[PDB]
Amino acid sequence: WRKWNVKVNHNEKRYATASAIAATAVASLVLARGHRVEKIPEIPLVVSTDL
Amino acid sequence: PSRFTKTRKHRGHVSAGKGRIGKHRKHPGGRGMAGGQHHHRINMDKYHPGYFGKVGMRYFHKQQAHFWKPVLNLDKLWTLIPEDKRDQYLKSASKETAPVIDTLAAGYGKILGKGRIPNVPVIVKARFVSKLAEEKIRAAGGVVELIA
Amino acid sequence: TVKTGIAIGLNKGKKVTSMTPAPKISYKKGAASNRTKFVRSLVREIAGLSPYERRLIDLIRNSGEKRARKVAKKRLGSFTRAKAKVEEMNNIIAASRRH
Amino acid sequence: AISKNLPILKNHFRKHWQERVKVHFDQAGKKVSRRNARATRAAKIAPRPLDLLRPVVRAPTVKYNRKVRAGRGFTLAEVKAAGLTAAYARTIGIAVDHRRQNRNQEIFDANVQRLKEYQSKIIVFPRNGKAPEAEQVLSAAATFPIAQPATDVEARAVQDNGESAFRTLRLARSEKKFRGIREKRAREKAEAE
Amino acid sequence: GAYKYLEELQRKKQSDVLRFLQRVRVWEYRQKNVIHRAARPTRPDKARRLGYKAKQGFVIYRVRVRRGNRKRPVPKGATYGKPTNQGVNELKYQRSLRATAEERVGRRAANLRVLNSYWVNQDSTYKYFEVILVDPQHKAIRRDARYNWICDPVHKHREARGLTATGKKSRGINKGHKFNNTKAGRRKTWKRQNTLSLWRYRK
RNA sequence: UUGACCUCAAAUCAGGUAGGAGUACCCGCUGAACUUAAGCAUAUCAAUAAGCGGAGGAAAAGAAACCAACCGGGAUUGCCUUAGUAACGGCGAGUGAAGCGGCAAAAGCUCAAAUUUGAAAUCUGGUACCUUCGGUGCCCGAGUUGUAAUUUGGAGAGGG
RNA sequence: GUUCUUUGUAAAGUGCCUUCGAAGAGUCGAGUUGUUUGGGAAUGCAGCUCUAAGUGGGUGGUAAAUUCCAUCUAAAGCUAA
RNA sequence: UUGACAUUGUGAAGAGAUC
């Protein structure tokens, strides 16, 4: 009965995933994870839907 | 997180923050509220005044339904109108058309008088009212229909 | 009833146009039932009185009902039952010892 | 052990309370067991949609009487009022509650209006054969929403007689408390010689 | 019918006729064994509204249970504990004399099933009961969809588990505010409301 | 003397059934003290642990002699909540539910009490064949001190 | 799905007016003794003593009498999730 | 060890206003 899971406010939980989405732009933070982006045309990377 | 606790700063010190004279032992002051008249009295007085004794009538089989009477001050009472429609009523405020506010629909049991609704006539349905509540409504130009 | 149409007072509560449908056939479980009237009569004129019912028709002749309703509240359970039990033993006295 | 300034706390652990601890780790593991058994039964039961009609009913006591709710069943009076028998309503997927009564006209007109639009909007398979399967719609209450009526209108005229509201509640409140004292006052009046 | 007359005659138990029969019968049984076979009901319409039929495979037994209270046994009345619990003589044994009777025949004939029992008689020393027993492995009861629910295994030894009519009173099982403590059963509802329910996300 | 009848027996009578194990969960009975109260005796521990009887894949409960005071609800059960509240208690330590509401699951029923009396219409078994978890005919038997059909309070029955 | 079987002068269901409407006792209830419950002039159970009624009875969380209203229909039985 | 109620039915004598 140790607490295992954790509640996070649904609005704050949403606050994080809208930062993580705004953070996949801004090339400088992508390189800081690895993710060799040097060769890619631009960022964000938008591919035709046919994929 | 136990890496943040202070007994992970007390490693190496003999008595672990509990003192070397009084030590730390099982129950020095008895379990729970024990001694509340006797050796903890000075504590109960000051920070629990009124703890001991009996006040008034018992009530057998009490139900909080009978006693349900939420209160809505004249402070708000315009919140119950849709904010899109609301500013239609503020401007162009006349009789022969007046907003019917059912306060029981919104879960309110009584309309109190706390203060100053505007000058717009309004029809307020309520179960209960207060003597000041209507005087301000009725002087605003509206009326209070009672319902059940 | 005619609920008053406001939140408090006499017949308090909402005004509703009503229906009053036909009643359940229970509510009648105390029904008269002519056969039973005929059975219970004949059972009484075989069995008769019971030992404490022969001392209720002593005291109704002698001491009256105030002592009879009192001795029949202790013998039965209740006061409201002691009424209708002494009501009986008048009929047993009367309809026998008179006409 | 009473110290400092703290709210008194009644916490009832003086029994052996660790024997009886129930932790739910299966909250998400019983949710799929429960969505299975509903899809099991959705197929087993044929286009019959898992649930029975329920009446629109009015909620009890003081607090809830303003809302309007789903009940257990349709009151043999309301059943027969739509033109079908009690025991044949069981087999059309209609719930029949024999113990509730109709003391109200606008719940009655509501539940019978509810059985009409149900019995026109369903098909019943001929007992013989065939049954050109209709693709079950798994929910009744999805197509039969329990709704709240409109008892008044938003805008309308103001009727001012000067009745005073609160003044009416004060009188109605006193007249209930002293009603009894009026008889045993007037009883002693009438019994005079 | 003839059973509406017998019904009322047995409601007068102090009537001069029945207090003659009670006195001649109670002498009969007290000579017979404590549990013995009743060739026939003593109250045909009492058994009959309790589920008895007259056919092969409905059996009646007549059982005599000692009367009085329960004496908490103990050696020499010493309870060894708080004086709260030091009572010996006046303790009353939470099952009834009737349900003790349905229990002792249910052991003697274990091939049968106890359907019900009723009060035939009593005196100072004993009470007397007749227990209606059904035989589930007899072919008459196994068919006849009315009575074949007693052959199912969950109905073994109904008396010892307290599923009879008189044992559901002792368990205190009824609907209403008076029975809240034991309603769905005592130990099940006690154990549900001591349970500390800890959800994954702590509410 | 002969047969019935009631009741009670004897069979290595014909055919069946129960016991013992498991026992975590379930139904009861029986039943503590340590401990808490800074002592202790009511209380608490606890209607618990040990002892005992009885079951199942779940058990138990269950279709109201229910809750209510409402514009009334509608079998049981479980979760969330009501609520650590109403209330109990050297009113000390402590103990402590229920109705409504939101959900998961949803399902209802048949007996005693009726003259079928122009027809015990009902049943077990032995036996014989057969299309065999059973069917058909026949022969002792149960049963009138009442077996089936009709009816269970929501109704319903005999009529017309 | 496909076939063989016509069950029966069978059974069932629906309106109308009449005549009826059976409904569980050493139990309900009561006093008391012990237990038990949050249940408090007594929640449940159990003992011993008393012992019902039939427009009756139980309940309506403060004992009682008086008169009403509301509610269901006890002392027999089954049932899945 | 005593009293009361129940087991517990049938009825006579003699004192006490039940023994």
Helix count, DSSP H or I runs of 4 or more residues of chain D: 6
Write the H/E string of chain D, N to C: EHEEHHHEHH
One letter per element, helices H and strands E, the order of chain B comes to: HEHEEEEHE
Report the span from N to C terminus of chain D.
Answer: 75 Å
Number of strands of chain B: 6
What best-fitting shape of chain D do the alpha-carbon axes yield? extended
Helix content bin of chain D: 25-40%
Overall structural class of chain D, as computed from helix and strand content, comes to mainly alpha
Largest sheet of chain D: 2 strands, antiparallel
Percent of residues in helices of chain B comes to 10-25%
Number of E-state strands of chain D: 4
Structural class of chain B: alpha/beta
Biggest interface goes to: B-D, 43 and 26 residues
CA-based gyration radius of chain B: 29 Å
DSSP strand (E) fraction of chain B? Answer: 5-15%
Strand order of the largest sheet of chain B: 1-3-5
Q: What is the beta-strand fraction of chain D? A: 5-15%
CA radius of gyration of chain D is 28 Å
Can you tag this structure with a few keywords?
part of a larger assembly, 5 chains, B: 148 residues, alpha/beta, three-stranded parallel β-sheet, 3 helices, 15% helix, E: 203 residues, alpha+beta, Ribosomal protein L15e, four-stranded antiparallel β-sheet, 29% helix, RNA-binding
Protein architecture, described:
This is part of a larger assembly, with chains A (51 residues), B (148 residues), C (99 residues), D (193 residues) and E (203 residues). Chain A has 51 residues and is mostly helical. Chain A has helices spanning 10-22, 27-31. Chain A starts with 9 loop residues before the first helix and ends in a 20-residue tail after the last helix. Chain C is an all-alpha fold and 99 residues long. Chain C has one domain: Ribosomal protein L36 (Arc Repressor Mutant, subunit A), CATH 1.10.10.1760. Chain D contains 6 helices and 4 strands, in the order βαββαααβαα. Chain D has helices at 29-44, 76-81, 86-89, 105-120, 166-177, 179-190, and strands spanning 21-23, 56-58, 68-70, 155-156. By secondary structure, chain E is α+β, with helices and mostly antiparallel strands. Chain E contains 8 helices and 5 strands. Chain E has helices at residues 3-9, 18-31, 44-48, 97-108, 139-142, 158-161, 167-170, 186-193, and strands at 35-38, 58-66, 113-122, 126-134, 196-198. A 4-stranded antiparallel beta sheet of chain E has the order 1-2-4-3. Chain E is globular. Chain B binds chain D through residues 27-36, 40, 43-44, 47-48, 51, 65-66, 68, 85, 95-100, 102, 104-105, 121, 123, 125, 128-131, 133-134, 141-144, 146, and chain D through 1-6, 8, 61-63, 66, 151-160, 164-166, 168-169. The structure holds 3 RNA strands. Chain B: Belongs to the universal ribosomal protein uL15 family. Chain B: There is a cross-link at residue 95 (Glycyl lysine isopeptide (Lys-Gly) (interchain with G-Cter in ubiquitin)).
